[PDB]
Amino acid sequence: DFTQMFYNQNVKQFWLPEEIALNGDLLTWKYLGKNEQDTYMKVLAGLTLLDTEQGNTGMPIVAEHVDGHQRKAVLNFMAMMENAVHAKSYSNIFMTLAPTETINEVFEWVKQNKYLQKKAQMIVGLYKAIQKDDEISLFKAMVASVYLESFLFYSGFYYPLYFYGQGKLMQSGEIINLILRDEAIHGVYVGLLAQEIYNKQTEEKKAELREFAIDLLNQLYENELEYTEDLYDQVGLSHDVKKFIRYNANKALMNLGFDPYFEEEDINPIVLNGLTVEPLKDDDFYF
Amino acid sequence: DFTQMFYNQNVKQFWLPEEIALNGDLLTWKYLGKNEQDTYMKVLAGLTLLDTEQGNTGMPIVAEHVDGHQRKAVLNFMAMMENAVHAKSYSNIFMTLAPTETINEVFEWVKQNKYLQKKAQMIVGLYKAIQKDDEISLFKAMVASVYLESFLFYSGFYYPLYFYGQGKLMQSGEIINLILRDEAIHGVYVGLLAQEIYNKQTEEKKAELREFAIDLLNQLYENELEYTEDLYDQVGLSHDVKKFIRYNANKALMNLGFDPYFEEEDINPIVLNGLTVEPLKDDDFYF
Amino acid sequence: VPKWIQLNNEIMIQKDGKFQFDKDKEAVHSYFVDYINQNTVFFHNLKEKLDYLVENQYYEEEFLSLYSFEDIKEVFKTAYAKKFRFPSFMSAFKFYNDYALKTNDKKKILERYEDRISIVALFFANGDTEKAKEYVNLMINQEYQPSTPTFLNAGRKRRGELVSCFLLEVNDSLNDISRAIDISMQLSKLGGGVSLNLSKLRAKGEAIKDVENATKGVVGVMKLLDNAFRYADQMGQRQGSGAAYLNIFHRDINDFLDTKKISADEDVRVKTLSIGVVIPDKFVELAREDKAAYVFYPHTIYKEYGQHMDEMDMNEMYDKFVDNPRVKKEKINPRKLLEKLAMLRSESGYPYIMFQDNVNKVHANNHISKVKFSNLCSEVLQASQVSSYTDYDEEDEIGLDISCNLGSLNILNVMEHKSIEKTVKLATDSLTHVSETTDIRNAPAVRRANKAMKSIGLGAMNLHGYLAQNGIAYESPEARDFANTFFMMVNFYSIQRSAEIAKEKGETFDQYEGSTYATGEYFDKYVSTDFSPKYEKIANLFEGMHIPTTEDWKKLKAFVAEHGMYHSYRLCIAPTGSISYVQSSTASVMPIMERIEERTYGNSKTYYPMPGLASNNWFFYKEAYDMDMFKVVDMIATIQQHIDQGISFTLFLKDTMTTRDLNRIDLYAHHRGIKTIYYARTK
Amino acid sequence: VPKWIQLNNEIMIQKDGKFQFDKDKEAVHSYFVDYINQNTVFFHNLKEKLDYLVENQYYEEEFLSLYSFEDIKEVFKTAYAKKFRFPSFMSAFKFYNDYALKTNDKKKILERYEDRISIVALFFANGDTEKAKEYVNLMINQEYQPSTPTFLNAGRKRRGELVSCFLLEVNDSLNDISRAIDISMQLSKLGGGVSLNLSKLRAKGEAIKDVENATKGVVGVMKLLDNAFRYADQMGQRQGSGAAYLNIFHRDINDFLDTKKISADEDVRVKTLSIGVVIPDKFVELAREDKAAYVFYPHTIYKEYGQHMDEMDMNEMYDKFVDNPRVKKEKINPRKLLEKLAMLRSESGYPYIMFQDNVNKVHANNHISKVKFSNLCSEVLQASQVSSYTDYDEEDEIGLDISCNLGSLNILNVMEHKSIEKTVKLATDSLTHVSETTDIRNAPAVRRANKAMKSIGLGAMNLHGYLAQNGIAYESPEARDFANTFFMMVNFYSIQRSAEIAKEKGETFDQYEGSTYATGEYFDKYVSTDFSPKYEKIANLFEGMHIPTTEDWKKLKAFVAEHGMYHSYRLCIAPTGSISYVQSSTASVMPIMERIEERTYGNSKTYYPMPGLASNNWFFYKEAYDMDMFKVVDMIATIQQHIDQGISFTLFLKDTMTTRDLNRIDLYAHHRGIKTIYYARTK
Amino acid sequence: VVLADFWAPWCGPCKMIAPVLEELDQEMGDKLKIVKIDVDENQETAGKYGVMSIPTLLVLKDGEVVETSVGFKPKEALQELVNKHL
């Protein structure tokens, strides 16, 4: 009921890194404090590392196990965007803002970081556990994918959106907004594929899959809180970032056809600013 | 030395069939004989099948086994083109020119056609035989992919080109030329990757790989002859198409770094004609 | 999860294969004990409560001043003498969430049900203690339910108006269009729904003072009104709901209908404007005979004849328009237009189908004006005159714009008390008081028509609930017999009370002498046909009640001729979808949509079983979607013959039925005398 | 392609390295001979033409009845005695496509240039034959150009209004907002652009009758105004254009700017509503010191102080608002808001920037009111009083709303004829006649202010054309010296004519005694500083014309003190757009955007070199984008000091110049005394 | 032993069960009585047996309800349901 519509929306959102000139960001970058520059670098590396997993494994593995030519085509298109567009875009932002040696060090740090690794490996673990012709294992991986696309990225997206909403780092913020817009539709689409599997299950199996999804969400959420404090306490933003994580967790659940887990909260306004005909045959006029 | 330039070429060649309006072919299509329309539908259906498998299976599987994020990005992009752009374009052509029943019948015809099933069996079999960290199985699949890109498509491409060259079906022909332009660069790129693996081997191993490549080519060739006769005898063109596929077989071999295998012949000249946000500072408020 | 919601959640937890309907009483008891009593601020005496509410701008001091404090105290005591207990959790939840007065921080409950009822009764009586106690007994017995604006805002200071709906006639000028936008925003600020007649607006591509093909048609006015209602949306408490009505012979009818298409672009699509289509009998005749029809340009007709297109009789003037070379028109297919209407109702529920000739054939005030359009709920069918708003510093020719004061009878409670006469008369008095105390300074035509017409709306509800709780199937002929008898008695007593009010006040509604009430044409079918029940089972329901006979109707006709009628319009059946929960009644005379409604308020689902739903009457509460729509049309036409205004008739359709089935239901409704069709709900 | 269009395309065909500028005259000759002379209706005599035009409702009869036919014939002979010839094909094309009167089927042409000019002159003179001949000489010499509404509609029955602008004050009420919508539509149907001051409207989240967070802000009012202007699209021939102005200290200023963002959703975005931002000096001071600023909720200030936010001097009351706990506000960053303004102007050219203190520092009528907002062209700066439009059948408090009585002096033709005094006085008389004959009944405040203030707008055009054709660079100090002298002369003679009209009629404008003209404060810089040219080359341009001296200004000040001043406002420099082609002039006092304009008409590509362009003055006609914007600001500020109203100052920006450069230009304009900034045109 | 079918004319699943009951009567009609009751015309019986939904099949033995089946059932499932009580 939905693949051709998503095909259309995906291909009409096509874009390339070269379209946004990045050099003018140096005019606001130079005015940020060390903690702001440090947080931005770390967040950016976090997003880059997670998105690479999605391009190399997440999207291609789902495309491999999903049946249907049209679904495979949409999934291929999404994998292409991860590897050919998003990955180049993140690299471009980095090369503009930091010298080569600084980029290498930030990636070394974020690669060793406990909270980034915990979530990256949890997601990758579920992708590696998919078994041929087993729709339960596929569903679990789709849940992981939706959580990455619609939830885990957002502790990171917060900061570029925060600057973007203030008039700072506008070129890279525009790029991030385009990336985020792609991840949103990726999350919705994979969510619909997961609901299709979920709806084929018994009531007991459904309850079991719901418990899986909520348990996974809880593990990721508790690690996100730690990840958030680790990055954002030094710039005083953690309270507001936490509200943004919960709001996006609720969107991820709704993508999977589940009820929201967290109470509704308002979001930081700066980040918000960043964001059957049958013809009448006669004899029907007579009764 | 080459991936970056292929990356740039592939992304700059990006297109969608919807860019080309097809209603202009309606009259030249109406005017073709029943035999001509039948061959044309079947030819494009055979192409659709090849692109379906190249997009679903061939390109993604090669992407999985080839090392390097940039090489993977090129291969992922090529995969997307196969199933999200090329395979779909044929349906755009079908939906314009043919009634639903004729479309349904031709897709049923691909399923039961023995030559089309044989060529798919052979090519996809080699893709699915790739073993992780086994460069020889990968080479064999890359040879199969080059043969699909640079040889097997051409029994199909002949007919749209033959019409384009006579000023007939020129909108459909424009789509086909764009597809052909893509496959030419896809065949070169995969050919270069295959040569990388071949060049790592002993002379004895190389001799075996040439045997594999030539045996496979001959087996595919003999099947393609029967396919060509089956499609083109009713339009009187089988001998001409055979010359064309031999011409392109030589190009496939060359893409693999091998000498031409068939003698040169005169191709129908008709077919040849068918080819910033800078912030304010304290000193801007005083003049 | 709250305890009351969890107990209410136990309804669908079936034990022994049966629903736990007894858990709803437990749910309401838990709701009260754990939330309502705890969150209700209590005063040492009623004097302290009234003083606190008057001083804190909660109550008007004017309406409480006509009673001595002992009178108000005794009114409250006789309100609590009933010891009213809500029968379902949803009733109490809806009341204390939508109507009960709360503090400025919306944290504590200031009004009980018996306090809201007492305040509304004191407002209605206007200085009469005995009448106030009569109103208290009427409402605490839940025999009569004042409309949501009246029940919610009677006696309150932070109030809008007590009128639930307004109908505006838009004339064909920029001054009139701008004033219509102004009045729509003013009345939406007051909280009432606004319906506008766009049939007088000239078509798209018409001439503006020798400048030809300059008009944007009625669709530009729809965009203006849509943005006006979005702007004046009661600050977000409830989105501003407006209605636009267009005659089916207007040229812009296709553009008018295309506003509700999903494929329509945002430059032509309206979102807060409900659309209604007025279908004269001529359109049905043309569609039946398959002749090609013509929609006309209203300004050409105005120039040729001097009267607006909707002001003339379509059945008589259609051939003259078609044969007139000076009347511009475009050819349409009436059957294709009917199919477009059916598909639009299937896909969106719009437009509101109004059969103009079905309204005007039994309309008592055709001398004042024909009924050219309905309200936002397609049940207020009253005569209206367009207002010619002139330039600034130029006196405007103020016409009549319909203001409808609504009130609902609970058929179950009215019949169980054997009090049709007293309930109808007290409700008529209360609606008369609401009409009198209502003034609207920013709508001259609404105010003028409220003062002159004195039209009220006395609806009814819990028809299906009463029938199912009495073992009567809504589609059965016994149900139609009961509806015939009950609504004949309701009409009899409403007319009697209107005549008594006209006698007591010595005044009738303006232009009463030209109405069928004065000439006696209204009572012809009542002095000729006896409407007593034909089934002994139905006749046993009216035991202990005097059913008006033919002689009684003759006496009432003579009484009306001698003394007149105070109200131009008295009966109109509104959907009453919100107050139905509080009264534990089914919405309107419509059949129930669901036996157990599933509602989500927050993060918890709250099931509402139908009033009186149980195991013995499970199949009598047949869902409206499973029912034959022809039988529902028969029921509504049986009711409609005793209602001078319209009935909010909602069509409940299944997904299996096509657009031809919808057209068949529409044409059967037109043939059976149905005046208006509200919605096409698909399951 | 047509012969004239083909000849016009030979302008860009370069022979011997030079443009074929002489081909343009051949283009005019071909155009006339092959199209105009063939498709102009010719009558046996002027009597037959006049009878045909009045009888067929092309002309009004009242203005022609003031003259005998001999007088009209003499006036037309005077127009044709000049034997005016269009020097460029684009001039004739513009006139005979836009302003020439055509038959009702548009197949033929009824008016020549000498006919439209004669009719406009006969309208202006009002029964005076000598005055009509003087106006004919003034317009056929192309010294003075009446505005597009006045030139188009003078003496024609099928017309709109001769008024170009309408500046409406919108009070903080639903009745006032509804009246604003009504008046906006009633003035858009007249043709003139409408600008509205929305700073009095309370912000989003304000209270409506003591219920909090109820308002949706000024953005909803902008939605209503945008759809009102879309509805009043003047047939669609010229889309309904409207402006909205908001003080930068208004709380909704961020949402006010957010509607012009391309990324803005359709639920907030407005399309036909231009936006302007009024920036007091206080905001610039706050941005300069990089201290946190506050945007205030207007209704809290109105409740606390009894006065609107924009009626109080923010430079004095900003601290009082900030330290007032009963005044609601939120902290903002003034430099971030300035950067947002700069990027919004880079992306879309909006908003118009109005420096309120720059306007009010030299505003003569501050006693009547301070200038709170500008017009759609961001060049009218007049005192306005809000109108309190009350509920129906209640008397409304009518204020003052501004209107454009516009006319432009052709600086080239004015100074070639050495008739600055005569041209300025005749233009002032014509604008006075236009203001007097304007009677708008549906806009009460507009009519009252037109009767009371009697304000007119006398602009100038062809400044860059005159400078380049006289070998003066636009950025050169000699150009600024010439502009100083010329506009001081224009101001002197406009004040002199206003005082003469006040003496001859015995009346001044309303509340003249409080103006700086009566107190003599206006003439301080004129009696203290000599504005004679400081350059010998510039002084030779004024040879043969008496340049007013300090003593002459003292005599004028005494004359004004004794006799008064008839016009509250006299001078305002409009953009002078499509009518600049007809006069063969550069648009306004702005520098030329391109040396040769590339215009598309149908299937043809038409080229319009700026008047007088040739090889010798090719580099004097420097493109506006190539100019230094600081020197253009200097030029305008030199002109601005002699213009009592504002100047439509368009910023011409290169693609490489960032938002910091735009902000530097804006702050230099504010520092140099620029009153308004119209557009940010990026190349 | 009686198989009582609670049905309605508008119920799609009730139209599907009608031919299944006719085949069941041909095979088992010597040991099984099949009774149909229209719930649109006979609300009191449908209320007495607490019928919720249609088709509802009650197996009665000597006037007592011994088994209840809701929704559509194929012939073999109805035979198994009845054969338990023969």
Ligand SMILES: [Mg+2]
């Ligand atoms: Mg009119």
Ligand SMILES: [Mg+2]
């Ligand atoms: Mg007010």
Ligand SMILES: [Mn+2]
């Ligand atoms: Mn990505």
Ligand SMILES: [Mn+2]
């Ligand atoms: Mn993604």
Ligand SMILES: [Mn+2]
């Ligand atoms: Mn391909």
Ligand SMILES: [Mn+2]
């Ligand atoms: Mn390929």
